[PDB]
Amino acid sequence: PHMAALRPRLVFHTQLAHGSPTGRIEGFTNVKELYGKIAEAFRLPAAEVMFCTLNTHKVDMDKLLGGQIGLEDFIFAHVKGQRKEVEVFKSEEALGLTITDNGAGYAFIKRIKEGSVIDHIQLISVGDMIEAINGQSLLGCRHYEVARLLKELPRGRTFTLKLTEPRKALGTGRGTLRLRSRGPATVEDLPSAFEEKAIEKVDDLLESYMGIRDTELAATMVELGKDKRNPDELAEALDERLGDFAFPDEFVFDVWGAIGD
Amino acid sequence: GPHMAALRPRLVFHTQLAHGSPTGRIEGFTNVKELYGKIAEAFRLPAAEVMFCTLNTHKVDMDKLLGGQIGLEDFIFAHVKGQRKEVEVFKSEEALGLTITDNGAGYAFIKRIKEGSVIDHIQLISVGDMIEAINGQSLLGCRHYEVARLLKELPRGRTFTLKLTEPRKAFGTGRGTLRLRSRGPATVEDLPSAFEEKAIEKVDDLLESYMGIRDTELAATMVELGKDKRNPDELAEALDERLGDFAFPDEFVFDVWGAIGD
C-alpha cells in the first residue's frame, strides 16, 4: 500500500488558541486553505487567522506550524491464515523462542534467535500463533504459560506444535501531512533524526544571514539539496524558486555543508 | 478548551487487513479485545480471526507490534488577531535584535527577540506579534525575508513606527497518544519520554530473561506502576495488586526497580 491511498480523508481537530470548543476540518492542500477551513469552522473571516501552533495553545515558537502536520497511527490487522503442524526435536535446553500474546487469548512467536534449533527449522516463523503443544490446546493461555510449557518439554524428545500462520500478501512509519510552500501537499514519512538536525542547521543559517526563520523553507531546502552533488548544483536549485531571497553564495556553501553526512 | 480531556469527542482510527483490504474506520474500543472485535466487524469476519495488530506497516514487524499505545494526529491551535499596538522606535546603527517569520500566507510576525537588544528593551513588543505596517506602509502580503530586510535597511537615527497586532491569548511535541492499559482504563496521555521508552525496553528484556516472553504493554504497565514508588518494596506492593497473578520473584522486582531508574 502506498501511503496516500490509506486514508480517503485527512481530518484534523482544531481550537482557537485563546479558547474555543473543538472543530473538525479537512480538505486543504496548502496553508492558505488550512487557514480558510479553520476560520470557516469558527465563523471567522479568514483574514483573522495569524498562525498555527501544534499541540499547544501557547505562543510557543518551538511548536509553530512549520510544514508538517502529523497523522495518527494506522492499524494493520493480521488474521488467521495457513494452519501448520510441525515436529521439532529438542536438541538443546534452549530452543531459541520468545513468546508474546495478543492480550486476548492468542499467544504467538515474537522472536526466533538466529542459530537456534527453531531457526534451523524452516517451517516456523515469527508471527505464527501457537495453538497446541503435544496436543495440549493453548487457546486462552498467556504467553508465559506457553513459554513455561516450552521450557519444560523433555530435552531428549520430539515435540509437535500446532501453528496458525497469519495471512500475508528507520522509524515508526507513522505518516505526516507535508504542507509544501511551492506546491500541493503530500503525505510523507517523518523526517529522520539526521534530517531534523540538518533542518535546524539550515534554519540557523536563515537567521544569521537573512534575519528570518522558517522551518518549512528549511525543510524544503534540505529535501531540495540532498541529491545535489556540489554547491553549484545546489545554488542552481535555490535560484530556481528563491531568487528574491538573494542568497549570498556563502549561504549556499553553508547550506551545502549543513545538509551532508 | 485545551485540557487533554476536552480535545476530541471521539478517537477514530483507520485500519486494513495486513494481507490486503480496503480501509475501514473504527471507534469505541476501550481494550484490545474490543479493538479486535471492531476490526473484525468492519471487515465482516468472526472476531476469533484477528490474530494481532501492527502499527503503520502491513509486514510482520514485531518492532511495530501494537504494544499499548496508539498515537494520535497533531492538534491544531489557531492564533487569531487580537490587540492592536503602535510602537515608535529609534533606529540605531546596531541590529534591532529581531527574527522574523511568516505564516506562509502574507502575515509576517516576530519569532524571536534577542535578550538585551533594542527590541528587548521595548517591552511593548512581543514574540508572536505580527507586523502590519512600518511607518504606515502596509506589510500585509510581504514575506518574512522582505520584512527582515526593510527593518535592516531603516535609516539610522530616525524613529520608525510599528503597527502591530497581538494574537488573542488565553488568561516533547505534546502530541497525544491513546494508552490502552491492560490493567486500567484506556486514556489519552502524553507520549512517553525518551527515559520511559528506554526503561520499558529494559523491562521487556527482563520479561524475556525471567519468563521467556516479551510484552511491551506489560512492560509499560510495570514502568507506570513504579514511577512514583520510593523503593523496591513499594514497587513489589503495586505489582502484587495489579499483577499478582504473575507471581514475580523478588530478584525480578528488584531488577525491574533498576530498569526504571538512572
Numbering used by the authors:
A (entry chain B): 49 to 217, 236 to 327
B (entry chain A): 48 to 218, 237 to 327
Could you pull the original sentences from the published paper?
GIPC1 (GAIP interacting protein, C-terminus 1) and its two paralogs GIPC2 and GIPC3 are universal adaptor proteins that bind and regulate vesicular trafficking of many transmembrane proteins. GIPCs contain a central PDZ (PSD-95, Dlg and ZO-1) domain that mediates the interaction with the C-terminal PDZ-binding motif (PBM) in cargo proteins.
We crystallized the GH1-PDZ-GH2 domains of mouse GIPC1 and determined its X-ray crystal structure to 1.9 Å resolution. A prominent feature of the GIPC1 structure is that two molecules in the asymmetric unit form a domain-swapped dimer. The domain swap is the result of an exchange of the last β-strand between the two GH1 domains. Due to the domain swap, the PDZ domain from one molecule is located in close proximity to the GH1 domain of the dimer partner. The overall shape of the dimeric GH1-PDZ module resembles a canoe with the two GH1 domains at the middle and the two PDZ domains curving upwards at each end. The GH2 domain wedges itself between the PDZ-GH2 linker and the PDZ domain, reminiscent of a passenger sitting in the canoe formed by the dimeric GH1-PDZ modules. Notably, the loop between helices α1 and α2 in the GH2 domain partially occupies the PBM-binding groove in the PDZ domain. Conversely, the PDZ domain blocks one face on the GH2 domain that binds myosin VI (as defined by the structures of the GH2/myosin VI complexes below). Therefore, the apo-GIPC1 structure represents the state in which the PDZ and GH2 domains mutually inhibit each other.
